[PDB]
């Protein structure tokens, strides 16, 4: 996160850290959507251009964390992956279209004050909250600037941007399964996700029932916090049916 600030304790109880077994290092962000399922970006697991192709045993998920590097004894919880599912039409070749993946935890995680699942949007909530100008919240332990790292979870609030403006800011072909967010050049304020924030949750708090919903996933961008540029996120609701299918049959 660039131009963000330290999150307060228990502010994002669904925030998950994708940790690599060897060498031990931060790999990506993710989110808890139930006691057995974690949601993240597909490029976090598979991306041939950089020889990235992880399997269930190469990773660990750390839930309930705040500090980036410390093992927060008695607070955080580490779980192993049982199975990983990448979207069948994930396009890593052209534009990271359908950049989404589900991970099944070996054992259910016990909820607490620092561990709680975020809600998955339904058609009504998505139609109501996914509007240009409406702000969302992104969190992660990623880089602070374009390439340095934060000691604690970073949070930043960003506005959703009109599709047209997103389209005219890059040569990358954008699809309906993605959206972009960030402040425009003349809005004064700034901020963006960056390398390391990948897979992190983009959430919004519903004014109707007070619940937090995950609308997007940190997918891609060009640089970090560059003027005229915007961060792109996987459109969660658009892929809700694939998400439900995987969960109901597996």
């Amino acid at each position: 996160i660039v131009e963000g600030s330290d999150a307060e304790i228990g502010m994002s109880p669904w925030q998950v850290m994708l940790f690599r077994k060897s060498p031990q290092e931060l790999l990506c962000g993710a989110s808890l959507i139930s006691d057995r399922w974690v949601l993240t970006a597909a490029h976090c697991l598979l991306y041939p251009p950089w020889d990235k192709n992880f399997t269930e045993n190469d990773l660990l998920v750390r839930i309930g964390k705040h500090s980036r590097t410390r093992y927060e004894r008695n607070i955080e919880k580490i779980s192993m992956l049982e199975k990983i599912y990448i979207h069948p039409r994930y396009n890593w070749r052209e534009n990271l279209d359908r950049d989404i993946a589900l991970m099944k935890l070996k054992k259910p995680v016990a909820f607490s004050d620092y561990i709680h699942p975020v809600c998955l949007p339904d058609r009504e909530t998505a139609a109501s909250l996914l509007q240009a100008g409406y702000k969302g919240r992104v969190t992660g332990w990623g880089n602070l600037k374009e390439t340095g790292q934060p000691s604690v979870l970073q949070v930043v609030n960003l506005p959703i941007v009109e599709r047209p403006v997103c389209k005219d800011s890059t040569r990358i072909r954008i699809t309906d399964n993605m959206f972009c967010a960030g402040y425009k050049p003349d809005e004064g304020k700034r901020g963006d996700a960056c390398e390391g924030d990948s897979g992190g949750p983009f959430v919004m708090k519903s004014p109707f029932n007070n619940r937090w919903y995950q609308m997007g996933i940190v997918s891609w961008g060009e640089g970090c916090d560059r003027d005229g540029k915007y961060g792109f996120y996987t459109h969660v609701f658009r892929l809700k049916k694939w998400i439900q299918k995987v969960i109901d049959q597996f």
Partner: peptide, 10 residues
């Protein structure tokens, strides 16, 4: 990063 307990590495 601070070392993760061994029993999770399995």
């Amino acid at each position: 990063y601070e070392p993760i307990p061994e029993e999770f590495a399995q």
